[PDB]
């Protein structure tokens, strides 16, 4: 079965061209005579431009194929103009005209000068790799993808040794070892079918690593989670039910080790955990299961009375990094409670506990989020004392942060 037809250009476009040139009162047989001649020349060239596509080993007819197909038929590749003498440009392609259907048809002559020129890409280089090693294709990134018998483990001993080396490097005794092992996790194509043992090693580790709050052990495991996520080959949402309660525990947990000093890292432990938490709510998303579940746990962590302030700071960070609208709709009705908590830490003399440090970190983070939440939905008018209607927390310093954001927008 082949219902191949012969499609020509419409004749009602050929009369428009003729009467816009000075040739009026053309017959229909005169006009049909134009549109079978030019529709043959388009068919003659597109069949001849397909020879250059095949010879150049491409599957896409580029714009230069018609320039050589025209030159082959002794017609000048010039499209915009036609030179009768032909001596200024002799069969020289000018690359066509960059024109559109939805164009503006008028530009300002200094708009084209002030725009930055595009980057000239890298020159052609010759890299070698291996498609086949004695018959087997390697999984390198240059490649696409009655007694019952004694059973064998589903991992090879080179794979099991690889797992042992990667896990003993990812506990961060040496930093270069970690970084390679993290890149190895980030781009090994054959790291599926080992992924249950990695997920179990992560999950089990954090739970027996928060019994004593060992921050490095945790910072290395969170970097291992981040290296597991950006690998494009492996299928992760079968294992995310073990991954997510591990990161929530890094963010919402108390620190058994020295309260101050590494709290700076603790904020980053909660910074790395809140980053990977909102990356996990960005991926793996179905209706009303993952993002809303962690949002509900974060909100009941917040509205809980008389929290641990480490848990409070971590949950505050976690709800803070959830995007544009989430702070637009959630952090709004709660400023008074935040201020009251800050006032209590301030009044009670107790300084040797971690409450004061937790309070300062929470207030700074909340104030930065409130700044753009404001820069985003209102003009920057009355930035001096109008914020005193919102208990006067960040006030003029919040206004200065909004001004810095406006300066960054101007730079953009």
């Amino acid at each position: 079965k082949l219902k191949l037809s012969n499609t020509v250009l419409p004749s009602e476009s050929m009369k428009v061209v003729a009467e816009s040139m000075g040739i009026a009162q053309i017959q229909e047989e005169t006009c049909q005579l134009l549109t079978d001649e030019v529709s043959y020349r388009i068919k003659e060239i597109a069949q001849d431009a397909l020879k250059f596509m095949h010879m150049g080993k491409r599957q896409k007819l580029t714009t230069s194929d018609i320039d050589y197909a025209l030159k082959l038929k002794n017609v000048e590749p010039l499209y915009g103009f036609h030179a009768q003498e032909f001596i200024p440009f002799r069969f020289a392609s000018g690359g066509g005209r960059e024109l559109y259907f939805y164009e503006e048809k008028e530009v300002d002559l200094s708009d084209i000068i002030n725009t930055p020129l595009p980057r000239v890409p890298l020159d052609v280089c010759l890299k070698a790799h291996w498609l086949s090693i004695e018959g087997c294709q390697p999984a390198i990134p240059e490649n696409p993808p009655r007694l019952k018998p004694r059973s064998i483990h589903e991992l090879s001993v080179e794979q099991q040794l690889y797992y042992k080396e990667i896990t003993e490097a990812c506990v961060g005794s040496c930093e270069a070892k970690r970084a390679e092992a993290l890149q190895s996790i980030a781009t090994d194509p054959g790291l599926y079918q080992m992924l249950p043992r990695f997920s179990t090693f992560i999950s089990e580790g954090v739970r027996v690593n928060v019994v004593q709050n060992n921050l490095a052990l945790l910072i290395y495991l969170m970097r291992m989670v981040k290296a597991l996520m950006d690998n494009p080959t492996l299928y992760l949402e079968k294992y995310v039910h073990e991954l997510i309660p591990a990161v929530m525990t890094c963010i919402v947990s108390r620190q058994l080790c020295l309260r101050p000093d590494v709290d700076n890292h603790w904020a980053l432990r909660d910074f790395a955990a809140r980053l990977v938490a909102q990356i996990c709510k960005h991926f793996s998303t179905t209706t009303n299961n993952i993002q809303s579940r962690i949002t509900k746990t974060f909100t009941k962590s917040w509205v809980d009375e008389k929290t641990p302030w480490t848990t409070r700071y971590g949950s505050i960070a976690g709800l803070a990094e959830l995007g544009h609208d989430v702070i637009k709709t959630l952090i709004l009705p709660r400023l008074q409670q935040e201020g009251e908590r800050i006032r209590s830490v301030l009044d009670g003399p107790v300084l040797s506990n971690i409450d004061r440090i937790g309070a300062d970190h929470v207030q700074s983070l909340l104030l930065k989020h409130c700044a753009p939440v404001l820069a985003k939905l209102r003009p920057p008018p009355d930035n001096q004392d109008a914020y005193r209607a919102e208990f006067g927390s960040l006030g003029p310093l919040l206004c200065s942060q909004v001004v810095k954001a406006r300066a960054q927008a101007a730079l953009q």
Binding site: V211, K238, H241, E242, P245, T249, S253, S284, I290
Partner: peptide, 25 residues
């Protein structure tokens, strides 16, 4: 549509919130 593979992935079928360790001891 309730036989879709996702319904059976254990993120959508497990109360994994209970695992998060809060103030453990």
């Amino acid at each position: 549509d309730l036989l879709a593979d996702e319904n059976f992935l254990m993120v959508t079928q497990l109360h994994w919130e209970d695992d998060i360790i809060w103030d453990g001891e």
